[PDB]
Structures are given as C-alpha cells and as structure tokens.
C-alpha cells in the first residue's frame, strides 16, 4: 500500500555556485523543494535536514589523500595546488568553488542519513534529491561530481542487507557506482544510458562485472532520442527479471533528470511521466528504497520531474496546473507540471530495444 517517506533537504544547497557558464546549478534543488512545498507535499512526509557528512564517513570509500585535498582546496589557494588539482581531476569540469567541501558534505549527508533510516526500518523510502553523484571515483572527481554519495549510501545499506540493487536512469552511465562494486555480487548495478562517443565513455552492454561480480553489472546502451514508449518497452521487463534473479533486500534508484526531453546537455526525449514510470515500477516491489537525484540541466524540468517523483513516492495525485511558487516565472510559458516530448528522431528502433533486452536476459540467466 502507501508508504512512509522521509525526505532530506538543506536550505543552503541552492547557494553553491559552480561558476559562470557551468551547467550544474545547485539552485535547481531549491526550485524542486519550493515547488513540492507549494503542492503541499510536506503534509504527507517527514522533512529532515541532513547532517554534514564527515571525513570519516567519506573515507569509507574515498582515499584519505583525496578527501584531505577536497577539505583543503579553495579558490584563494588554488595556485598552490596546481599539481594536486590535476591528480584529482579538479579545476575544469569539476571546478574549485566557494564551499565545495560543504556542498559535498550536504549532498552526501542526505544519502547516508537516508540509508541509516532505511536500515533502522524507520521509513519505507528515503529521498535525497541533492544526491546521486554517480561519476565520482575513489580518488578522483569526474563529470561535476566530487564525492560519491551513492557508493557511501550503498556501503551503509550493506551493513544490514546481503544484496543491494542499484538502478540508474540518468542519461549518463553510472560509472563510479559500477566501478566501486564491479567485483562483488553484494551489489548489482543496472544503468540505462546514452552510449556511443558520449560521456563518460563506459557502459557497453558487454561490461558485465568481473570475478565474484561477473554478471552483477548490467548496462543498457541507448541512442539519441529515446521516448516514453521505447523506455517503457524495456524498463519493467528488465527490472522484473533482475528482481526475480537477484532478489535484493534494498534498492537505490538514481533519478538523474538529464534523460528528459529538452535537457540542455542530454539528447533523450522522455517526459516527466515517462521518467516517473521508472519510480512507479521500482516502488511496486515493496522493498526499502533510497531515491536520489543526479544530472539535469534544464532546471525548470528538473524541478517538475523531482516534484512529480516525490508525489509518486507518496502515492499522491497532484494537479497539472502549477501552484504559485518562488520560481513561478521559470515554468512559463505554460505553467504546467507535465512536459511534451520534442519532434527529435528516436534513433532507438523497437527491434534494437528488444535485441539489447534479449542480450541482457541471456546474462541474467547466469545468476544462481
Ligand atoms: C563533455 C560532457 O558531456 N561532460 C558531462 C556532461 C554532463 C555530465 C553529467 O550529467 N554529470 C552528472 C552530474 C551529477 C551531479 C549532481 C550533483 C552535483 S554533480 C549527477 C549525475 C550526472 N550524470 C557529466 C559530464
Ligand atoms: Ca544511467
Ligand atoms: Na556488482
Ligand atoms: Zn548525467
């Protein structure tokens, strides 16, 4: 039936600025929050302010040297760390900005706090839209991500769960998460993503894991222009087969909104309803679920997406007419919650979708 939802948000998040022209806008988390508050969704869920995750918490995955660097680097001392910046991939796509470490701490704190709450059986779902930074690696920033809150939250879940399922609907391959768990069967990682000379360049369907983790990494490579129909063709069948074969006891769902139609960086054509169908599918399995944010560069659509997916988590129907809010002008000219797909060509034929699905089903037969 209906579930208990705990939601994590820190009002300071929207103030972190990656710099002039950088497409990552933490302000989108505040727009999301303000919109869902204006729909009255706070009446149906517990709202918590995450703690600032410490260096002890972050070094459960990341190296001491990389976390020490992130704690130290500032725009004022940048000149003195030119060598370290190159070593850790900080300074270009992953810039040094005021309060960078605090931004890492808040984004991470919500995911780890959500995992603790699920481990304690105090909630059915935990939501952290400021999380989902799937590209960060053990000792390296990547793709605007510095600290991998997802890996840390999964490590927290593994204290009480033998098997954790990770599902990733961001347009990009969930490389940092897949890499962290590549050689274990205790986490199965399932990523659906644009593939073919696209960032980060990994996630071929032939990448299936290694050693004990062989068959525990699943990749569904897609072409430009995927629509609700095509995505819906394959998501429920793959997740259903994964649930059947893997039998996880907890799930982490990365809800990156860069897979929506009209994304500034992305090349997919999903609506908010098509993207949210993924949350509905996963929610149906009735397992402890951690829902996380991710990419998303057309900020008005990110706020619509995560507001609607919070409503889905709550089994709460909300009107398409947007309520007034602090960012009302961002939603023009329509001022509606739902979006239309564009006329872009879907390069993913129905045969291609079915064929990749069949190849993944062959791999899933290899589980015990
Ligand atoms: C050349 C090129 O295309 N570069 C590039 C573009 C987009 C992304 C991205 O979408 N990154 C991301 C960031 C986050 C972050 C969330 C919060 C802070 S960063 C979460 C998920 C993804 N996929 C990464 C790299
Ligand atoms: Ca993905
Ligand atoms: Na794995
Ligand atoms: Zn992305």
Scored b (16 or more CB within 10 A) or e, 178-202 reads bbbbbebbbbbbbbbbbbeebbeeb
Distances (CA, A) of 119 to 124, 148, 156, 250, 319: 10, 19, 8, 9, 34
Which atom of ligand 1 approaches the CA of 144 most closely?
Answer: 19
Where on the phi/psi map is residue 143: left (φ > 0), alpha (ψ -120 to 50), or beta? Answer: left
Distance between CA atoms of 257 and 212, rounded to whole angstroms? 32
Distance between CA atoms of 294 and 209, rounded to whole angstroms? 23
In angstroms, how far is CA 107 from the centroid of its own chain? 12
Distance between CA atoms of 272 and 76, rounded to whole angstroms? 41
Q: Is there a cis peptide before residue 185, judged by omega within 30 degrees of 0?
A: no
Distance between CA atoms of 297 and 319, rounded to whole angstroms? 24
How was this structure determined? It was done by X-ray
Q: What phi and psi, each to the nearest 5 degrees, are found at residue 177? A: -70, -45
In angstroms, how far is CA 134 from the centroid of its own chain? 7
How far, in Å, is the centroid of ligand 3 from the Cα of 184? 5
78-85 CB contacts, 8 Å cutoff, 24+ apart: none
Q: Assess contact for 30 and 14: CB atoms under 8 A.
A: yes
Resolution of this model in Å is: 1.6
Q: Which residue has the least CA distance to atom 8 on ligand 1?
A: 143
Distance between CA atoms of 104 and 99, rounded to whole angstroms? 9
In CATH, what number does 1-368 get?
3.40.800.20
Distance between CA atoms of 210 and 127, rounded to whole angstroms? 31
Distance between CA atoms of 93 and 357, rounded to whole angstroms? 33
Distance between CA atoms of 255 and 186, rounded to whole angstroms? 22
Burial, 120: exposed, middle or buried (Cβ in 10 Å; 0-12, 13-18, 19+)? exposed
Tokens 């500034």 -> residue: 264
Q: Assess contact for 124 and 3: CB atoms under 8 A.
A: yes
Residues with a CB atom less than 6 Å from ligand 1: 24, 132-135, 143-145, 170, 172, 199, 256, 258, 265, 294-295
Q: Which residue has the least CA distance to atom 11 on ligand 1?
A: 143
**Residues that are catalytic:** 135
Q: Taking the domains of the chain in order of start, what are their residue ranges? A: 1-368
Distance between CA atoms of 171 and 266, rounded to whole angstroms? 7
How far, in Å, is the centroid of ligand 4 from the Cα of 296? 7
Angle at 14 between CA 319 and CA 55, to 5 degrees: 125
Q: What is the rounded radius of gyration, in angstroms, for the C-alpha atoms of the chain?
A: 19
Distance between CA atoms of 243 and 281, rounded to whole angstroms? 11
Q: Assess contact for 44 and 4: CB atoms under 8 A.
A: no
Distance between CA atoms of 51 and 57, rounded to whole angstroms? 11
Pairing, β 5-8 against β 125-128: parallel
Distance between CA atoms of 188 and 246, rounded to whole angstroms? 8
Half-sphere exposure of 141 (CA within 13 A, CB side): 24
3-state secondary structure the chain: CCCCEEEECCCCHHHCCCCCCCCCCCHHHHHHHHHHHHCCHHHCCEEECCCCCCHHHHCCCCCHHHHHHHHHCCCCCHHHHHHHHHHCCCCCCCCCCCCHHHHHHHHHHHHHHHHHHHHCCCCCEEEECCCCCCCCECCECECCECCCHHHHHHHHHCCCCCCEEEEECCCCCCHHHHHHCCCCCCEEEEEEEECCCCCCCCCCCCCCCCHHHCCCEEEEEECCCCEHHHHHHHHHHHHHHHHHHHCCCEEEEECCHHHECCCCCCCCEECHHHHHHHHHHHHCCCCCEEEECCCCCCHHHHHHHHHHHHHHHCCCCCCCECCCCCCHHHHCCCCECCCCCCCCCCCCCHHHHHHHHHHHHHHHCCCC
Angle at 163 between CA 157 and CA 169, to 5 degrees: 80
Binding positions:
21, 25, 168, 170, 172, 181, 184, 187, 191-192, 216, 258, 264
Among 245, 94, 116, 222, which residue's Cα sits nearest to residue 168? 222
Q: Assess contact for 53 and 136: CB atoms under 8 A.
A: no
Other beta carbons within 10 angstroms of residue 97's beta carbon come to 16
How far, in Å, is the centroid of ligand 2 from the Cα of 220? 8
Beta bridge pairs of residue 165: 188, 251
């Amino acid at each position: 039936g209906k579930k208990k939802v705990c939601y994590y948000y820190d009002g300071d998040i929207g103030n972190y600025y990656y710099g002039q022209g950088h497409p990552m806008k933490p302000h989108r988390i505040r727009m999301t929050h303000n919109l869902l508050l204006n729909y009255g969704l706070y009446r149906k869920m517990e709202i918590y302010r995450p703690h600032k995750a410490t260096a002890e918490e972050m070094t459960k995955y990341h190296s001491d040297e990389y976390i020490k660097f992130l704690r130290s680097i500032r725009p004022d001392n940048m000149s003195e760390y030119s060598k370290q910046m190159q070593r850790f991939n900080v300074g270009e796509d992953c810039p040094v900005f005021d309060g960078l470490f605090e931004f890492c701490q808040l984004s991470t704190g919500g995911s780890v706090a959500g995992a603790v709450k699920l481990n304690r059986q105090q909630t059915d779902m935990a939501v952290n839209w400021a999380g989902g930074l799937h590209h960060a690696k053990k000792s390296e920033a990547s793709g605007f991500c510095y600290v991998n809150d997802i890996v840390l939250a999964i490590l927290e879940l593994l204290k009480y769960h033998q098997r954790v399922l990770y599902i990733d609907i961001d347009i990009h391959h969930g490389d940092g998460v897949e890499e962290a768990f590549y050689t274990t069967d205790r986490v199965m990682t399932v990523s659906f993503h644009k593939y073919g000379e696209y960032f980060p360049g990994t996630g071929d369907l032939r990448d299936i894991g290694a050693g004990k983790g062989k068959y525990y990494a699943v990749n569904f490579p897609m072409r430009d222009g995927i629509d609700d129909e095509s995505y819906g063709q394959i998501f429920k069948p793959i997740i259903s087969k994964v649930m059947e074969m893997y039998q996880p006891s907890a799930v982490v769902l990365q809800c990156g909104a860069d897979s929506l139609s009209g994304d500034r960086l992305g090349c997919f054509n999903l609506t908010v309803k098509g993207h949210a169908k993924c949350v509905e599918v996963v929610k149906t399995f009735n397992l402890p679920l951690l829902m996380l944010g991710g990419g998303g560069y057309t900020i008005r659509n990110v706020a619509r997406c995560w507001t609607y997916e919070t409503a889905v988590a709550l089994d709460c129907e909300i009107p398409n007419e947007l309520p007034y809010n602090d960012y009302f002008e961002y939603f023009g000219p329509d001022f509606k919650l739902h979006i239309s797909p564009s006329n872009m060509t879907n390069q993913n034929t129905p045969e291609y979708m079915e064929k990749i699905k069949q190849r993944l089903f062959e791999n899933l037969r290899m589980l015990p």
